Swiss-Prot record, chain A:
Component of the mitochondrial ribosome small subunit (28S) which comprises a 12S rRNA and about 30 distinct proteins. This is Small ribosomal subunit protein mS23. The modification N6-acetyllysine is found at K101. The modification N6-succinyllysine is found at K82.
UniProtKB/Swiss-Prot annotation, chain C:
It comes from the Eukaryota. The keyword Ribonucleoprotein applies. The gene is Mrps2. GO terms for molecular function: structural constituent of ribosome. Component of the mitochondrial ribosome small subunit (28S) which comprises a 12S rRNA and about 30 distinct proteins. Belongs to the universal ribosomal protein uS2 family. It is found in: Mitochondrion. This is Small ribosomal subunit protein uS2m.
From Swiss-Prot, chain D:
Transmembrane segments: none annotated. It comes from Mus musculus (Mouse). It comes from the Eukaryota. It is found in: Mitochondrion. Belongs to the universal ribosomal protein uS9 family. This is Small ribosomal subunit protein uS9m.
UniProtKB/Swiss-Prot annotation, chain E:
The chain holds residues 76 to 175 of 186 of the full protein. GO terms for biological process: mitochondrial translation. This is Small ribosomal subunit protein bS1m. Keywords: Acetylation, Mitochondrion, Phosphoprotein, Ribonucleoprotein, Ribosomal protein, Transit peptide. The keyword Acetylation applies. The gene is Mrps28. The modification N6-acetyllysine is found at K57. The keyword Acetylation applies. Belongs to the bacterial ribosomal protein bS1 family. GO terms for cellular component: mitochondrial inner membrane; mitochondrial small ribosomal subunit; mitochondrion. Its main location: mitochondrion. It is found in: Mitochondrion.
C-alpha cells in the first residue's frame, strides 16, 4: 500500500500523507534526513510547455569588454599561428597578450581605437611575436 | 488493510472484436477504497471474469491512496470548483449537520 | 541502552555539516573539471534556465555557485543515508562511463545498475527479485537521460515508489522529479570522474563515522 | 553482490571483468592461435 | 577565493572566442581501429581518422594539432522541438605537435 502518484506532491509529502493516513507505520530511514536538510526546491512535477507569442527566455549573452578587442584581432590577424592549449589553466595566447597590452595603453589615456590597435601591434613586434596581417 | 473499505462505482461489459472469437467480452470495474479517516484511492480493473476484475481493481487502488484534508474532520476547507475534461464539479463547504447532498457516487 | 541508540541516530541531525562534506569540493575544483559546460542553447530545457549562468556564444554556462550550494545539499543527504546503512544505487546509461560507475559503486560498497533497465524493476520488484527484496533507499543518477535522449525510466518509477533521487542534471535534462538536483556537466570525463570521486569519498566517510560513533557509545555502556 | 539490481548479476559481473581486462591491454600497449580445434562454449 | 565570474572571464575557453577555424592542441585518449578520439579541452571530444602518413605515431596520449569547427554538433530538424545532438565535437586533425 502506497501512493504511486508521482504527479501530485513529492516523495516527502506523499510519505508524510501515508503516515498520517495510517498505512505506513514505520518512518523510512531517509525521512528524518529530508526534514532536517531539505532540498532548495521541492521536487514536484511540472509539465514542460512551449513558450507562445512574445514570451522569451532569460539568459544573458556572455560578452566581456575584451571581446571588442578580440574580435578586431581575429579579423585582422586571424588566430595566432601558435596553437591554443586549453589544458593549461594559465595559458596565455597570442591574442590574450594583445588584449593585455591594448588595455595597458588604454589605461594611459589613449582614446582612439585606431591608435591603440596600431600601437599594440608595434609593441608586440618589439616583443618578437610574429603577427601576420592576413586579409585572406 | 482491514481498516479500508472498497466500494464499486461502475461495472461495464466492454467488447473487443477478435478474429478467433468474434465479439469477446471483458468486465471493466471502477472501485474506490478508503479508511474513512482521510485516505482514499481508486483504480480500474479489467478481466474476463467479474470476480477477477474486482480483485484487480481492489488491490490496485490501494497503491494510489490520496490523503484528503478535512476541515475539523467533517468537511472540505473551502469551496472547490473545477472542470475535468467535460465534467464540471462545484463543491461547497457546509456546517455540521448539513449531511452529504451530492451525486450518489460522490456520497460513496 | 536506548539512550545510546538515540545518540547514534539522532545526534548526527543536530549539526549542519556533520560529515564535513564542504571541504571535499570547491567552486575552483568544479571549474577545473569543466562542470560548468552545458549543451548548446537549442538543446536547453525550460526547467534548467534557473541554473544557467548564461550563454557564451551558443554554449550555455552553468552557474557554479548554484551548483556548489546544491551539491553541498546532495552530498550531505547522501552521507546521512550512508550513515544510517541505507542502500544506495548508482544509475546511468552512458556507456562511455559504464565501467567507471560500476567500479565506483564497488569501491563505495554500494550498488550500480548501468545496464538496460527492465520495466517494472521497482514497481514490480517482488515478482522480479523475490518476495522480501529490499528496494534501494536512494538512487544517484549520474545521468538522468537514456541513450534515446529521453528521461531514464527510473526517474519516474523511483518517484512512484517514493525513493529520493540525487541526480546530475545538465542544461538539456528535466530536474523536476529529482529530489536533490546537482546542476553540472554530465558528458565530460573530467566532470563525471569528479562526481564519482565525491560520492565515493562521501559514502566511505559516512560509513567510517558510523563505526566510530558505535564504538564510542558502545564502550560507554561497560565504562 | 553490487550488481544485484541489474537482474543478471552473474552475466554482468563476468562482462565487467572482461571489459576491464580489455582496457588494461589496450592501455598497456604475436600469433593468437594458442589453442586449435576448440569451440566457444554454447 | 576567486569568484566563478572571475574564473569564467579569464578562462582559456572564454579567451578562445568563436571556435570556428581556430587552432587547438588535443590528446588522444581512445583509439578504435583507425578512429582517434581526441580531447581538445572542450565539453565533447572529436573523432578523426588516422592519417596515412606517420600512422604509427598516433598512439594514446599523443598530443596533436586540430582546427576546431564546432564544440558540439547540433541541429534542429523539421518538426523537432529541440536540437538533435550527437554528443560529439567537430575538428580537423592537422598532425602531431612538435614536443620541442
Ligand atoms: Mg550533457
Amino acid at each position: 500500500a502506497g501512493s504511486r502518484l508521482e504527479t501530485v506532491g513529492s516523495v516527502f509529502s506523499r510519505t508524510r500523507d501515508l503516515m498520517r493516513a495510517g498505512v505506513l507505520k514505520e518512518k523510512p530511514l531517509w525521512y528524518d534526513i529530508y526534514k532536517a536538510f531539505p532540498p532548495l526546491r521541492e521536487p514536484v512535477f511540472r509539465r514542460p510547455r512551449l513558450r507562445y507569442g512574445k514570451a522569451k527566455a532569460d539568459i544573458q549573452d556572455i560578452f566581456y569588454q575584451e571581446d571588442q578587442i578580440r574580435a578586431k584581432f581575429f579579423a585582422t590577424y586571424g588566430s595566432g599561428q601558435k596553437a591554443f592549449d586549453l589544458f593549461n589553466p594559465n595559458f596565455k595566447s597570442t591574442c590574450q597578450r594583445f588584449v593585455e597590452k591594448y588595455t595597458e595603453l588604454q589605461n594611459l589615456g589613449e582614446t582612439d581605437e585606431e591608435k591603440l590597435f596600431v600601437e599594440t601591434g608595434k609593441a608586440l613586434l618589439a616583443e618578437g611575436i610574429i603577427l601576420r596581417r592576413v586579409r585572406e | 488493510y482491514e481498516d479500508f473499505d472498497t466500494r464499486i462505482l461502475e461495472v461495464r461489459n466492454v467488447f473487443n472484436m477478435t478474429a478467433k472469437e468474434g465479439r469477446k467480452k471483458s468486465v471493466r470495474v471502477l472501485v474506490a477504497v478508503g479508511n474513512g479517516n482521510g485516505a482514499a484511492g481508486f483504480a480500474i480493473g479489467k478481466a474476463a471474469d467479474r470476480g477477477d476484475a474486482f480483485r484487480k481493481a481492489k488491490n490496485r487502488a490501494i497503491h494510489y491512496l490520496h490523503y484528503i484534508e478535512r476541515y475539523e474532520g467533517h468537511t472540505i476547507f473551502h469551496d472547490i470548483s473545477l472542470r475535468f475534461k467535460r465534467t464540471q464539479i462545484r463543491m461547497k463547504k457546509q456546517p455540521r449537520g448539513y449531511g452529504l447532498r451530492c451525486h450518489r457516487a460522490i456520497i460513496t | 541502552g536506548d539512550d545510546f541508540q538515540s545518540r547514534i541516530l539522532d545526534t548526527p541531525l543536530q549539526h549542519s555539516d556533520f560529515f564535513n562534506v564542504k571541504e571535499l569540493f570547491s567552486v575552483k575544483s568544479l571549474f577545473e573539471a569543466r562542470v560548468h559546460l552545458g549543451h548548446k542553447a537549442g538543446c536547453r530545457h525550460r526547467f534548467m534556465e534557473p541554473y544557467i549562468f548564461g550563454n557564451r556564444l551558443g554554449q550555455d554556462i552553468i552557474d557554479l555557485d548554484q551548483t556548489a550550494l546544491n551539491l553541498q545539499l546532495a552530498l550531505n543527504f547522501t552521507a546521512h543515508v550512508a550513515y544510517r546503512k541505507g542502500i544506495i544505487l548508482f544509475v546511468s546509461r552512458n556507456r562511455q562511463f559504464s565501467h567507471l560507475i560500476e567500479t565506483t559503486a564497488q569501491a563505495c560498497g554500494e550498488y550500480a545498475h548501468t545496464r538496460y533497465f527492465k520495466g517494472g524493476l521497482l514497481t514490480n520488484a517482488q515478482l522480479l527479485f523475490g518476495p522480501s527484496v529490499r528496494l534501494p533507499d536512494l538512487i544517484i543518477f549520474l545521468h538522468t537521460l537514456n541513450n534515446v535522449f529521453e528521461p531514464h525510466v527510473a526517474v519516474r518509477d523511483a518517484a512512484k515508489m517514493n525513493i529520493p533521487t540525487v541526480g546530475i542534471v545538465d542544461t538539456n535534462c528535466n530536474p523536476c522529479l529529482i529530489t536533490y538536483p546537482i546542476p553540472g556537466n554530465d558528458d565530460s570525463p573530467q566532470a563525471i570522474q569528479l562526481f564519482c570521486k565525491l560520492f565515493r569519498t562521501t559514502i566511505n566517510r559516512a560509513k567510517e563515522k558510523r563505526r566510530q560513533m558505535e564504538a564510542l557509545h558502545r564502550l560507554q555502556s561497560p565504562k | 553482490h553490487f550488481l544485484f539490481y541489474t537482474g543478471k548479476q552473474s552475466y554482468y559481473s563476468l562482462m565487467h571483468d572482461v571489459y576491464g581486462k580489455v582496457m588494461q591491454l589496450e592501455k598497456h600497449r604475436a600469433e593468437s592461435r594458442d589453442l586449435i580445434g576448440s569451440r566457444w562454449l554454447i | 577565493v576567486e569568484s566563478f565570474a572571475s574564473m569564467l572571464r579569464h578562462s582559456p575557453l572564454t579567451q578562445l572566442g568563436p571556435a570556428k577555424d581556430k587552432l587547438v592542441i588535443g590528446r588522444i585518449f581512445h583509439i578504435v581501429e583507425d578512429d582517434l578520439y581526441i580531447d581538445f579541452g572542450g565539453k565533447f571530444h572529436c573523432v578523426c581518422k588516422r592519417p596515412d602518413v606517420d600512422g604509427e605515431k598516433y598512439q594514446r596520449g599523443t598530443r596533436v594539432r586540430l582546427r576546431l569547427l564546432d564544440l558540439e554538433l547540433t541541429s534542429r530538424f523539421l518538426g523537432g522541438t529541440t536540437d538533435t545532438t550527437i554528443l560529439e565535437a567537430d575538428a580537423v586533425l592537422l598532425g602531431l605537435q612538435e614536443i620541442r
